Ligand binder design. Structure first.
Ligand SMILES: O=S([O-])[O-]
Ligand SMILES: [Cl-]
Length: 415
């Protein structure tokens, strides 16, 4: 008696980690869980083919931003029942709960599995040497920029590189997460990517507030705070640069905390100066709010499964306390289930405690069926803004004309 699950590579040994996660469930139910690991390069197309053909697994992982699109194809089983048995809506952050359904939909089609959230890592030694107080650097945007000006002026050299640290490392346009990097700034200025008006969704990227947050973020790169080399690279490469002592400050997820403990030999950075001088702070309070970008993944049940009762039991298991703590450990993510945040594995680690403070500002995109195309069209136009930054040519006026073009393309795709 077997269940099939599709996952993406969430942990260092994806298949082995997941088989170890579900071993107590297999024992309690006398069943085998078969897991297939889908590379992020192919997971979407594969899940899409499963949806159209009626051929696929019992359960699939979905990126949180995938929920709307797959739910709208009519192929996912309602899991309102699973979510109630896990404690219902108030068992989750509002931003995580929004990812359980197509936006506006009556029934839940996905169970929260784990959360990817971004906070700022910083070199405690570099801020010390630049005379930057971390509380002030991360309390306002003015403080954030004043902090980067002291880090730019600083004579601090990394003990290993014997070279200056870049004040801020961030990707520009050559990364999968272009929109995610900008989102906190758009939100913090009081804006948003999409808005409801006359009862339908429209681009809000050209709103006054959205443009202010975007220009604030992008102009940091234009003022000398971000290396030109950062703008050509992806998030993984920027991670590597921070580990190798080239960056004072950069946004990433909780997984860096585990990597700081792992030898270079085994793909961690324990021996690097950065590992022993690691601070974390949430994104700084904006003038019109304070927001932490949430992503990560949920689990869903194809309505063609012949094993819905056992699959729902496995959804309750994976979504529930013990597996929530266990898989967060394996993946270096935060549990989707808020009760799992009190586990000693989190509470005994001050860096994880800071990620839990960052979690209270949690915000996600609305779960639109057409979210992919909105994000893709946004990212096309943000990329052109990053090109202007790279030349020192981004003005507020030039940013507005690109986001007006973005907004016309987005509105047509939504209309
Ligand atoms: O360092 S103590 O806060 O875990
Ligand atoms: Cl939004």
């Amino acid at each position: 008696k077997t269940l099939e699950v599709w996952i993406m590579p969430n942990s260092p040994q994806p298949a082995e980690d997941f088989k170890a996660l579900v071993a107590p469930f297999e024992k309690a139910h006398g069943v085998e869980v078969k897991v297939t690991v889908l590379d992020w390069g192919v997971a979407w197309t594969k899940i899409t083919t499963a949806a159209t053909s009626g051929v696929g697994p019992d359960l699939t992982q979905l990126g949180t931003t995938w929920v709307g699109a797959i739910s709208a194809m009519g192929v996912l089983e309602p899991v309102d029942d699973v979510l109630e048995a896990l404690g219902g809506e108030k068992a989750y952050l509002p931003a995580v709960w929004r990812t359980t359904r197509l936006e506006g939909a009556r029934q839940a089609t996905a169970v929260p599995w784990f959360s990817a959230l971004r906070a700022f890592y910083y070199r405690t030694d570099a801020l010390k040497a630049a005379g930057v107080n971390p509380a002030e650097m991360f309390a306002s945007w003015q403080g954030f920029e004043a902090g980067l000006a002291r880090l730019k002026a600083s004579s601090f050299r990394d003990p290993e590189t014997k070279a200056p640290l870049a004040p801020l490392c961030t990707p520009g346009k050559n990364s999968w997460d272009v929109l995610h990097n900008a989102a906190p700034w758009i939100w913090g200025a009081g804006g948003e990517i999409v808005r409801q008006a006359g009862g339908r969704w429209q681009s809000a990227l050209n709103s006054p507030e959205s443009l202010e947050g975007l220009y604030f973020f992008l102009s940091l790169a234009q003022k000398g705070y971000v290396p030109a080399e950062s703008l050509e690279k992806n998030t993984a490469q920027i991670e590597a640069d921070f580990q190798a002592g080239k960056c004072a400050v950069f946004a990433s997820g909780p997984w860096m905390i585990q990597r700081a403990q792992v030898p270079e030999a085994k793909g961690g950075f324990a021996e690097r100066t950065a590992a022993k001088n690691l601070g974390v702070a949430p994104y700084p309070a904006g003038p019109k709010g304070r927001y932490t970008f949430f992503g990560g993944s949920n689990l869903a049940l194809f309505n063609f499964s012949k094993n819905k009762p056992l699959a729902k039991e496995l959804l309750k298991y994976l979504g529930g306390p013990e597996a929530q703590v266990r898989y967060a450990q394996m993946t270096g993510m935060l549990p989707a289930l808020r009760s799992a945040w009190s586990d000693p594995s989190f509470q005994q680690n001050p860096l994880l405690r800071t990620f839990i403070q960052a979690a209270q500002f949690g915000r996600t995109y609305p779960s639109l069926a057409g979210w992919g195309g909105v994000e893709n069209l946004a990212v096309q136009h943000l990329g052109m803004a990053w090109d202007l930054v790279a030349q020192g040519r981004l003005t507020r006026e030039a940013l507005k004309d690109l986001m007006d073009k973005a907004s016309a393309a987005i509105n047509q795709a939504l209309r």
